[PDB]
Amino acid sequence: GVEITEGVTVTAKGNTEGNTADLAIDGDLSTYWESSNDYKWIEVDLGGIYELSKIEIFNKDEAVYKYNIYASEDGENFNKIAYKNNDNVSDSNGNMHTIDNVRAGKIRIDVVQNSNSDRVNIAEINVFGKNTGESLPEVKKIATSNFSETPWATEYEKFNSDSAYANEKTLNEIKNLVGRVIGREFKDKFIFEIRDQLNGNDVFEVSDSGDGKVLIKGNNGVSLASGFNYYLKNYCNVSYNPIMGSNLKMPETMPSVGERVVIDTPYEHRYALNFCTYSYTMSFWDWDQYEEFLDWCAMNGVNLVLDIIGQEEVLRRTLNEFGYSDEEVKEFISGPAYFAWFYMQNMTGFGGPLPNDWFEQRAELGRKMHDRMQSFGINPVLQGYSGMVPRDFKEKNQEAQTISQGGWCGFDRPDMLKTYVNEGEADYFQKVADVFYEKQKEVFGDVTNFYGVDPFHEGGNTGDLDNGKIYEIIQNKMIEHDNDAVWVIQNWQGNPSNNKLEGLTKKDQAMVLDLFSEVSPDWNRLEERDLPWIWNMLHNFGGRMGMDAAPEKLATEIPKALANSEHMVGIGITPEAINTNPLAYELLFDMAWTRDQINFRTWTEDYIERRYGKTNKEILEAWNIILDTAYKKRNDYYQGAAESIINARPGFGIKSASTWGHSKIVYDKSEFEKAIEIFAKNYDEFKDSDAFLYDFADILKQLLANSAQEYYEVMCNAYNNGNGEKFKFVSGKFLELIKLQERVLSTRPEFLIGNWIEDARTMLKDSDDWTKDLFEFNARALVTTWGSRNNADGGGLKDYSNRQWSGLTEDYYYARWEKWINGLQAELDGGAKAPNIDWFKMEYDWVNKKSDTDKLYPTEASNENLGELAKIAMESYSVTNMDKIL
Ligand SMILES: CC(=O)N[C@@H]1[C@@H](O)[C@H](O)[C@@H](CO)O[C@H]1O
Ligand SMILES: [Ca+2]
How many CB atoms are located within 10 Å of the residue 115 CB? 15
Task: Write the CB contacts of 259 (distance below 8 Å, at least 6 apart in sequence).
Answer: none
Q: Return the ligand 1 atom nearest residue 274 CA.
A: 12
CA gap 689, 400 in Å, rounded? 61
**441 close to 148: Cβ distance less than 8 angstroms:** no
Transcribe 480-525 into DSSP letters.
HH-TT-EEEEEEBTTBS-HHHHTT-S-GGGEEEEETTTTTS---HH
Torsional sign, CA 739, 741, 746, 750: negative
- CA 363: distance to chain centroid? 19
Quick one: CATH architecture of 136-265? 2-Layer Sandwich (3.30)
Quote the radius of gyration of the chain (alpha carbons, Å). Answer: 29
**67 close to 54: Cβ distance less than 8 angstroms:** no
| Superfamily name with CATH number, domain 1-135 | Galactose-binding domain-like (2.60.120.260)
Question: 576 CB under 6 A from ligand 1?
Answer: yes
CA gap 439, 147 in Å, rounded? 10
Question: 792 CB under 6 A from ligand 1?
Answer: no
Task: Write the CB contacts of 423 (distance below 8 Å, at least 6 apart in sequence).
Answer: none
> Which residue minimizes the CA distance to atom 3 of ligand 1?
542
How many CB atoms are located within 10 Å of the residue 490 CB? 21
Going by C-alpha positions, the residue among 445, 442, 468 that lies closest to residue 455 is 468
Beta bridge partners of 80: 70
Ligand number nearest CA of 346 is 1
Q: What letter represents residue 565's amino acid?
A: S
Angle at 868 between CA 864 and CA 872, to 5 degrees: 115
Per the rule left: phi > 0, alpha: psi between -120 and 50, beta: everything else, 78 is: beta
Q: Return the ligand 1 atom nearest residue 341 CA.
A: 7
**69 close to 83: Cβ distance less than 8 angstroms:** yes
> Which residue minimizes the CA distance to atom 10 of ligand 1?
492
In sequence order, which ranges of 69-189 are alpha helices (DSSP H)?
Answer: 151-161, 163-181
Which protein residues have their CB within 5 A of the ion that is ligand 2?
Answer: 23, 26, 28, 31, 124
List, in sequence order, every beta strand (DSSP E) within 312-445. 379-383, 388-389, 402-403, 407-408, 411-412, 415-417
Question: 35 CB under 6 A from ligand 1?
Answer: no
CA gap 275, 450 in Å, rounded? 15
Q: Return the ligand 1 atom nearest residue 346 CA.
A: 7
Strands 486-491 and 510-514: parallel
Query: For residue 749, is the peptide bond before it cis, meaning its omega torsion is within 30 degrees of 0?
Result: no
Transcribe 200-220 into DSSP letters.
TB-EEEEEE-SSSPEEEEESS
> Which residue minimizes the CA distance to atom 15 of ligand 1?
541
Torsional sign, CA 263, 484, 174, 183: negative
Going by C-alpha positions, the residue among 808, 762, 769, 758 that lies closest to residue 785 is 808
Ligand number nearest CA of 26 is 2
CA gap 386, 416 in Å, rounded? 8
Q: How far is CA 213 from CA 181, 227, 317, 332, in A?
A: 18, 14, 51, 56
Going by C-alpha positions, the residue among 459, 462, 440 that lies closest to residue 451 is 440
Per the rule left: phi > 0, alpha: psi between -120 and 50, beta: everything else, 133 is: left
CA gap 465, 414 in Å, rounded? 17
Question: 542 CB under 6 A from ligand 1?
Answer: yes
**230 close to 176: Cβ distance less than 8 angstroms:** no
CA gap 865, 877 in Å, rounded? 17
CA gap 485, 477 in Å, rounded? 10
Q: What is the dihedral of CA 365, 371, 375, 379, to 10 degrees?
A: 80
Instruction: Fill in the DSSP letter of residue 140.
Output: P
Strands 568-573 and 510-514: unpaired
Mutate to test the pocket of ligand 1, among 513, 541, 544, 658 (most ligand atoms within 8 A of CB): 541
Per the rule left: phi > 0, alpha: psi between -120 and 50, beta: everything else, 275 is: alpha
How many CB atoms are located within 10 Å of the residue 555 CB? 23
In what helix (H) or strand (E) does residue 315 lie, and over which residues does it extend?
A: helix 311-319
Q: Return the ligand 1 atom nearest residue 639 CA.
A: 15
User: How many residues can be counted in the chain?
Assistant: 886
Instruction: Report how far apart the first and last C-alpha atoms of the chain are (Å, whole number).
Output: 66
**404 close to 392: Cβ distance less than 8 angstroms:** no
CA gap 197, 710 in Å, rounded? 56
Question: 338 CB under 6 A from ligand 1?
Answer: no
CA gap 245, 239 in Å, rounded? 8
Quoted resolution (Å): 2.0
CATH 2.160.20.60 fits 597-886, yes or no: no
**67 close to 109: Cβ distance less than 8 angstroms:** yes
Going by C-alpha positions, the residue among 169, 535, 565 that lies closest to residue 377 is 169
CA gap 699, 708 in Å, rounded? 14
CA gap 608, 615 in Å, rounded? 7
- CA 434: distance to chain centroid? 30
Top-tier CATH class for 266-596: alpha beta
In what helix (H) or strand (E) does residue 103 lie, and over which residues does it extend?
A: strand 95-114
* Method by which this entry was solved: X-ray
List, in sequence order, every beta strand (DSSP E) within 409-475. 411-412, 415-417, 450-452
Domain coordinates in residue numbering, the chain: 1-135, 136-265, 266-596, 597-886
CA gap 855, 264 in Å, rounded? 53
Task: Write the CB contacts of 315 (distance below 8 Å, at least 6 apart in sequence).
Answer: 329, 332, 333
- CA 419: distance to chain centroid? 31
Query: For residue 302, is the peptide bond before it cis, meaning its omega torsion is within 30 degrees of 0?
Result: no
Ligand number nearest CA of 126 is 2
Q: What is the phi/psi pair of residue 383, to 5°?
A: -95, 145
Ligand number nearest CA of 94 is 2
Q: Return the ligand 1 atom nearest residue 660 CA.
A: 15
Distance (Å) from CA 391 to ligand 1 centroid: 23
Instruction: Fill in the DSSP letter of residue 52.
Output: E
Mutate to test the pocket of ligand 1, among 273, 275, 276 (most ligand atoms within 8 A of CB): 276
Side-chain-facing half-sphere of 649: CA atoms under 13 Å: 20
Task: Write the CB contacts of 200 (distance below 8 Å, at least 6 apart in sequence).
Answer: none
Question: 69 CB under 6 A from ligand 1?
Answer: no
Q: Return the ligand 1 atom nearest residue 786 CA.
A: 1
Q: What letter represents residue 3's amino acid?
A: E
Task: Write the CB contacts of 838 (distance below 8 Å, at least 6 apart in sequence).
Answer: none
Mutate to test the pocket of ligand 1, among 271, 576, 578, 784 (most ligand atoms within 8 A of CB): 576
Going by C-alpha positions, the residue among 409, 316, 452 that lies closest to residue 658 is 409
Question: 343 CB under 6 A from ligand 1?
Answer: no
Q: What is the phi/psi pair of residue 224, to 5°?
A: -60, -45
Q: How far is CA 700 from CA 408, 525, 856, 863, in A?
A: 37, 42, 27, 16
Question: 541 CB under 6 A from ligand 1?
Answer: yes
**310 close to 301: Cβ distance less than 8 angstroms:** no
CA gap 448, 333 in Å, rounded? 24
Beta bridge partners of 69: 82, 109
CA gap 512, 527 in Å, rounded? 10
Angle at 794 between CA 805 and CA 648, to 5 degrees: 30
Strands 124-131 and 41-58: antiparallel
**535 close to 570: Cβ distance less than 8 angstroms:** yes
Beta bridge partners of 11: 43
Q: How far is CA 785 from CA 459, 648, 657, 793, 842, in A?
A: 22, 12, 12, 8, 10
Question: 492 CB under 6 A from ligand 1?
Answer: yes
Q: Return the ligand 1 atom nearest residue 457 CA.
A: 9
CA gap 696, 689 in Å, rounded? 11
- Per residue, the 3-state secondary structure of 710-768, as one string, reads HHHHHHHHHHHCCCHHHHHHHHHHHHHHHHHHHHHHCCCHHHEHHHHHHHHHHCCCCCC
Task: Write the CB contacts of 547 (distance below 8 Å, at least 6 apart in sequence).
Answer: 581, 626, 630, 631, 641, 672, 698, 699, 702
In sequence order, which ranges of 550-599 are alpha helices (DSSP H)?
Answer: 551-563, 582-590
CA gap 587, 604 in Å, rounded? 9
Question: 110 CB under 6 A from ligand 1?
Answer: no
CA gap 357, 144 in Å, rounded? 10
**176 close to 186: Cβ distance less than 8 angstroms:** no
> Which residue minimizes the CA distance to atom 8 of ligand 1?
276
Going by C-alpha positions, the residue among 630, 549, 625, 563 that lies closest to residue 597 is 563
Angle at 307 between CA 404 and CA 367, to 5 degrees: 120
CA gap 305, 273 in Å, rounded? 6
**226 close to 298: Cβ distance less than 8 angstroms:** yes
Question: 314 CB under 6 A from ligand 1?
Answer: no
**462 close to 336: Cβ distance less than 8 angstroms:** no
Task: Write the CB contacts of 618 (distance below 8 Å, at least 6 apart in sequence).
Answer: 678, 681, 682
Q: What is the phi/psi pair of residue 616, to 5°?
A: -145, 180
In sequence order, which ranges of 564-689 are alpha helices (DSSP H)?
Answer: 582-590, 600-612, 617-628, 669-681, 683-686
In what helix (H) or strand (E) does residue 358 lie, and over which residues does it extend?
A: helix 358-376
CA gap 564, 269 in Å, rounded? 18
b/e 706-745 (16+ beta carbons within 10 angstroms → b): bbbbbbbebbbebbeeeebebbbebbebbeebbebbbbbb
Distance (Å) from CA 796 to ligand 1 centroid: 12
